Design a protein around this nucleic acid. Structure first.
Ligand SMILES: Nc1nc2c([nH]c(=O)n2[C@H]2C[C@H](O)[C@@H](COP(=O)(O)OP(=O)(O)OP(=O)(O)O)O2)c(=O)[nH]1
Ligand SMILES: [Ca+2]
Ligand SMILES: [Ca+2]
Ligand code: NA
Ligand code: NA
Length: 326
DNA sequence: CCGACAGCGCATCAGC
DNA sequence: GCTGATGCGC
DNA sequence: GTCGG
C-alpha cells in the first residue's frame, strides 16, 4: 500500500460526504479517486502527480499537497472534532441505519452504542439485528472460514434440489484472503427470463439453511433477494464463530453471466464498467446488456454466453475476477 | 461552462 | 390495498 | 468533485 495515507484520507472524506453531507456524487467522486490512487504503482510525491490520474481533480490534488506536507488534512481534523458529524458517522456503522435515520436519532438524543441498546423499541427490524451483531459485523472473514461456509451452503442447497447451482461471488470470487461478508448467487432451471415454473425457489433454500442453524437472522427477504445473518458451527468447548452477513440472490438461469459479473464486483469496478458501457452506447445490469438507441431508450438484450462476451461489447479486454478489485 | 454521474431489490410511508 | 417516493442495502 | 463536449 504505497499510498495508504492518501487513500485513507479520501475514503474518510467520501464517508463524510455520504453520511453527513448526504452528497452521493461527492462520495462517488472521492471513492473513484481513492480507487485509482490505490492501484497507481508509485509512491505519490505531489498533488500534480496525482492530478494526472482520471478522477483526481484540482481540489483533491490540493488536499494531497496538504497531506504530503503535514501528514494531515485540516478539513478532516475539523470534521473529527464536530460532535454531530462524529455521531452521525458512528450511527451509520450499524446495518440499517443510513444518513437520514442517523441524523434523526442524533436529534432525539440517541447517539451512542449505549443509547441504541436501551432504545431497541425505536429501531426497525433490520436496525435491531444490525445493533445485535454490531461488533461481529465489524470483523472480516478469513478465506478459510469462507471455504467452510461455501461447503455448507453448496451441500445444503444440493440437498434441497440437485438442480440448484450456488456460486459464491463478491471478494471471495476475486480471490481475496479475507471477505467482509458472503454473497451467494443462486440459479435453478425452473426460473428463467421466460418463465417461473416453480414458486418459493429462494424460500426453500433459506428455510433449509435455517433448519441446519446456518442462517440465524433475516434482515430482508423477497422472491429474488435474501439479506441476513449466518454462523459456522463450532466444536466442543470451542468459542463460537462470529455471526456473519450473508446475501443470496436468485437470478434467472439464462442470465447467469450478467448476474455473476454484477455479484463479483467490486462495487467501484461495476460503476466504472457500467459507466464505460454508457459511454460506448450500452447499458449493463445484473440481467442483461442492451444497446442504447438514438432515442436514449434501451434496446433488446444482446446474446451473452460468457462474462467475456460482456467485456467484448464494450471493447474492454477481459479481466479475471482477481483483477476487478478496484 | 454545465449536464451527468450505474443500476436495482426490499422495507417503509404518504396519499388516495 | 395499491402506487410512487424515499431510505438503505447489494 | 471530476469530467466531456
Ligand atoms: N456494497 C456494494 N456492492 C455493490 C454496489 N454496486 C454493485 O454492483 N455492487 C456489487 C459488487 C459487489 O462486489 C457485490 C457484493 O457486495 P459486497 O458489499 O459484499 O462487496 P465485496 O464482496 O466485493 O467486498 P467485501 O464483502 O469483502 O467487503 O455487489 C454498491 O454500491 N455497493
Ligand atoms: Ca461480500
Ligand atoms: Ca454482501
Ligand atoms: Na485527473
Ligand atoms: Na449503516
Amino acid at each position: 500500500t504505497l499510498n495508504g495515507g492518501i487513500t485513507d484520507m479520501l475514503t474518510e472524506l467520501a464517508n463524510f460526504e455520504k453520511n453527513v453531507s448526504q452528497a452521493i456524487h461527492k462520495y462517488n467522486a472521492y471513492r473513484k479517486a481513492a480507487s485509482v490512487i490505490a492501484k497507481y504503482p508509485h509512491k505519490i510525491k505531489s498533488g500534480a502527480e496525482a492530478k494526472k490520474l482520471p478522477g483526481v481533480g484540482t481540489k483533491i490534488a490540493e488536499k494531497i499537497d496538504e497531506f504530503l506536507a503535514t501528514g494531515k488534512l485540516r478539513k478532516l481534523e475539523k470534521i473529527r472534532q464536530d460532535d454531530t458529524s462524529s455521531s452521525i458517522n458512528f450511527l451509520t456503522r450499524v446495518s440499517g441505519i443510513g444518513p437520514s435515520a442517523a441524523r434523526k436519532f442524533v436529534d432525539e438524543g440517541i447517539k451512542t452504542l449505549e443509547d441504541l441498546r436501551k432504545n431497541e423499541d425505536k429501531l426497525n427490524h433490520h436496525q435491531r439485528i444490525g445493533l445485535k451483531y454490531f461488533g461481529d459485523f465489524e470483523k472480516r472473514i478469513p478465506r478459510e472460514e469462507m471455504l467452510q461456509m461455501q461447503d455448507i451452503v453448496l451441500n445444503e442447497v444440493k440437498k434441497v434440489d440437485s438442480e440448484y447451482i450456488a456460486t459464491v461471488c463478491g471478494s471471495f470470487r476475486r480471490g481475496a484472503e479475507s471477505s467482509g461478508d458472503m454473497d451467494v448467487l443462486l440459479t435453478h432451471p425452473s426460473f428463467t427470463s421466460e418463465s417461473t415454473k416453480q414458486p418459493k425457489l429462494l424460500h426453500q433454500v433459506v428455510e433449509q439453511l435455517q433448519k441446519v442453524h446456518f442462517i440465524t437472522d433475516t434482515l430482508s427477504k423477497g422472491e429474488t433477494k435474501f439479506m441476513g445473518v449466518c454462523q459456522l458451527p463450532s466444536k466442543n468447548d470451542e468459542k463460537e464463530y462470529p455471526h456473519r452477513r450473508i446475501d443470496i440472490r436468485l437470478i434467472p438461469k439464462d442470465q447467469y453471466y450478467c448476474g455473476v459479473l454484477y455479484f463479483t464486483g467490486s462495487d467501484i469496478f461495476n460503476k466504472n464498467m457500467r459507466a464505460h458501457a454508457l459511454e460506448k452506447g450500452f447499458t449493463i445490469n445484473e440481467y442483461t446488456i442492451r444497446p442504447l438507441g438514438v432515442t436514449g431508450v434501451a434496446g433488446e438484450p444482446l446474446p451473452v454466453d460468457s462474462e467475456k462476451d460482456i467485456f467484448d461489447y464494450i471493447q474492454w479486454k477481459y479481466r479475471e475476477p482477481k483483477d476487478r478489485s478496484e
